[PDB]
Design a protein around this ligand. Structure first.
Ligand SMILES: *[C@@H]1O[C@H](CO)[C@@H](O[C@@H]2O[C@H](CO)[C@@H](O[C@@H]3O[C@H](CO)[C@@H](O)[C@H](O[C@H]4O[C@H](CO)[C@@H](O)[C@H](O)[C@@H]4O[C@H]4O[C@H](CO)[C@@H](O)[C@H](O)[C@@H]4O[C@H]4O[C@H](CO)[C@@H](O)[C@H](O)[C@@H]4O)[C@@H]3O)[C@H](O)[C@H]2NC(C)=O)[C@H](O)[C@H]1NC(C)=O
Ligand SMILES: *[C@@H]1O[C@H](CO)[C@@H](O[C@@H]2O[C@H](CO)[C@@H](O[C@@H]3O[C@H](CO)[C@@H](O)[C@H](O)[C@@H]3O)[C@H](O)[C@H]2NC(C)=O)[C@H](O)[C@H]1NC(C)=O
Lengths: 108, 51, 51, 126
C-alpha cells in the first residue's frame, strides 16, 4: 500500500525530490508524514518526523512538503553520502501507519 | 477489554433484541457507559446489569 | 474535548425503529477534559474577590 | 543515549510461530509507544502494529488481524511479539522502534515518529 517511485538520480551539487502518494484518508487527512533513510545493510535512519520538521543531527539539506493526497521529500546539495534508500511512513487507516516501497538515490 | 487493553469507563453489554419479526429475537451488543448501567437485583453479584 | 475515536452502530428494533449505540473505540483510550488558562483564571478570581 | 535490544536470529519450519522479544534501554519503559516493523529481504518497510506499554492496548494492520499478537512485561522492561502461521514469505528482518509519547489527553499512538530503532533480528522460514 501507498505508492512511491522506484528510484531517482542526479549529479553532485544538484537537488532532487522523492514523492509519496496515498488515498485521501492516509495522507490527505493528516499532516503525519515521516521520511526514513536506509543505507543498505543498516537499520533505517530518522530524517523528517512531521511533514516539514527535522530532528537533531539531520542536515538542512533535507526538507519535506505536502500537497493534497501526496507529499515529497527534497534532497539538496547532493553528494556521495546521500546514496541510500528512502522510505516514507504516514498515518494510515483507522489508527494505523502505512509505509511506502522506498526510493533509491544514485549520485553520479 | 478492547484489543488486549482495559477501558475503565465503558462496559461491553450483550442483550437479546427483538427483530422486526415479533417471533425471532437476536443477540446484539453495544458499549454502554457506566452511570447508564446498574447491577441487576436478585442475583449473586453476577455479571447481570440493567439500564 | 473527547479524544477517542468512537464509532456508531445501529440496532434494528421493531417495525422500522433503530437504536444507535457505540460499537467500538478505534484508536486508543483517553480522558475527557476541559482546559482553562491558569493566569486568566487567577485574574478572574482576583477581580471577583475585589468586587 | 538510548538503545533497543532484540532477540537473536531465528530459524523455523512453516507453521511453528515465533515470539520475538525487545528490550529498550536508556529511558522510562512506559513513556513511549512501541511500534513493530518488518522488512523482507530486498523489500520495503511494512508496519505490523503498535503497543501502549502503560496499559497493554495494541493494534495491528488489517493483513495481520489475529495473525499477530504482542505483549509486554513492565517489571523486566521488555516487549514481545508473537507471529502466527509462518510461511516462507515471512522471512524478514523485524525491527522494534520507539513511537510517540504517551499522554492521557491526546492520542499519539498513530504518530509515525520512530525516534530510535532496534538492531533488527532475522527470522528464517524454510
Ligand atoms: C489540555 O491541557 C493539557 C495539559 O496542558 C494538554 O496536554 C498537553 O498537550 C501537549 C500537546 O498539545 C503535550 O505536548 C507534548 O509534550 C511532550 C513532553 O515532552 C513533548 O515531547 C511533545 O513534543 C514533541 O512531539 C511533538 C509532536 O508533534 C513535536 O511537535 C515536538 O517538536 C516534540 O517533538 C520531539 O520530541 C518527540 C517525542 O516523541 C519526538 O518524537 C520528535 O520526533 C521530536 O524530536 C526529538 O527527538 C529526536 C530524536 O528522535 C531528537 O533528535 C530531537 O532533538 C528531539 O529531542 C509535545 O509537545 C503535553 O505533553 C500535554 N501535557 C500532558 C500533561 O499530557 C492537552 O493537549 C490540552 N487539550 C487541548 C484540547 O488543548
Ligand atoms: C477515526 O475513525 C474513522 C472511522 O470511524 C476513520 O475513518 C475511516 O478510515 C478508513 C481508512 O481505513 C476508511 O476506510 C475506507 O473506506 C473507503 C470507502 O469510504 C473504502 O473504499 C476503502 O477501501 C477503505 O475501506 C473509512 O471509510 C473511514 N470512515 C470515515 C467515516 O471516515 C478515521 O480514519 C479514524 N481517525 C483516527 C485519527 O483514528
Amino acid at each position: 500500500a501507498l505508492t512511491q517511485p522506484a528510484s531517482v538520480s542526479g549529479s553532485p551539487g544538484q537537488s532532487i525530490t522523492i514523492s509519496c502518494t496515498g488515498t485521501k484518508y492516509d495522507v490527505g487527512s493528516h499532516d503525519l508524514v515521516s521520511w526514513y533513510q536506509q543505507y543498505p545493510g543498516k537499520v533505517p535512519k530518522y530524517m523528517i518526523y512531521e511533514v516539514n520538521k527535522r530532528p537533531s543531527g539531520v542536515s538542512n539539506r533535507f526538507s519535506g512538503s505536502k500537497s493534497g493526497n501526496t507529499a515529497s521529500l527534497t534532497i539538496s546539495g547532493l553528494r556521495a553520502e546521500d546514496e541510500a534508500d528512502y522510505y516514507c511512513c504516514s498515518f494510515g487507516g483507522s489508527a494505523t501507519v502505512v509505509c511506502g516501497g522506498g526510493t533509491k538515490v544514485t549520485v553520479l | 477489554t478492547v484489543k488486549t487493553g482495559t477501558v475503565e469507563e465503558m462496559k461491553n453489554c450483550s442483550f437479546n433484541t427483538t427483530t422486526e419479526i415479533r417471533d425471532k429475537e437476536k443477540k446484539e451488543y453495544a458499549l454502554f457507559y457506566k452511570p447508564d448501567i446498574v447491577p441487576l437485583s436478585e442475583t449473586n453479584n453476577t455479571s447481570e446489569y440493567r439500564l | 474535548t473527547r479524544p477517542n475515536n468512537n464509532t456508531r452502530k445501529s440496532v434494528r428494533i421493531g417495525p422500522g425503529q433503530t437504536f444507535y449505540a457505540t460499537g467500538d473505540i478505534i484508536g486508543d483510550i483517553k480522558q475527557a477534559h476541559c482546559n482553562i488558562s491558569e493566569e486568566k483564571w487567577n485574574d478572574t478570581l482576583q477581580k471577583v474577590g475585589i468586587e | 543515549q538510548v538503545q533497543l535490544v532484540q532477540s537473536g536470529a531465528q530459524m523455523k519450519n512453516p507453521g511453528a510461530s515465533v515470539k520475538v522479544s525487545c528490550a529498550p534501554s536508556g529511558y522510562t519503559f512506559t513513556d513511549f509507544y512501541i511500534h513493530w516493523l518488518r522488512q523482507a529481504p530486498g523489500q520495503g518497510l511494512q508496519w505490523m502494529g503498535w503497543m501502549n506499554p502503560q496499559t497493554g492496548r495494541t493494534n495491528t494492520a488489517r493483513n495481520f488481524q489475529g495473525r499477530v499478537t504482542m505483549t509486554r512485561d513492565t517489571s523486566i522492561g521488555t516487549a514481545y511479539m508473537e507471529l502466527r502461521s509462518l510461511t516462507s514469505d515471512d522471512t524478514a528482518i523485524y525491527y522494534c522502534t520507539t513511537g510517540g509519547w504517551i499522554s492521557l489527553y491526546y492520542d499519539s499512538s498513530y504518530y509515525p515518529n520512530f525516534d530510535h530503532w532496534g538492531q533488527g533480528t532475522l527470522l528464517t522460514v524454510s
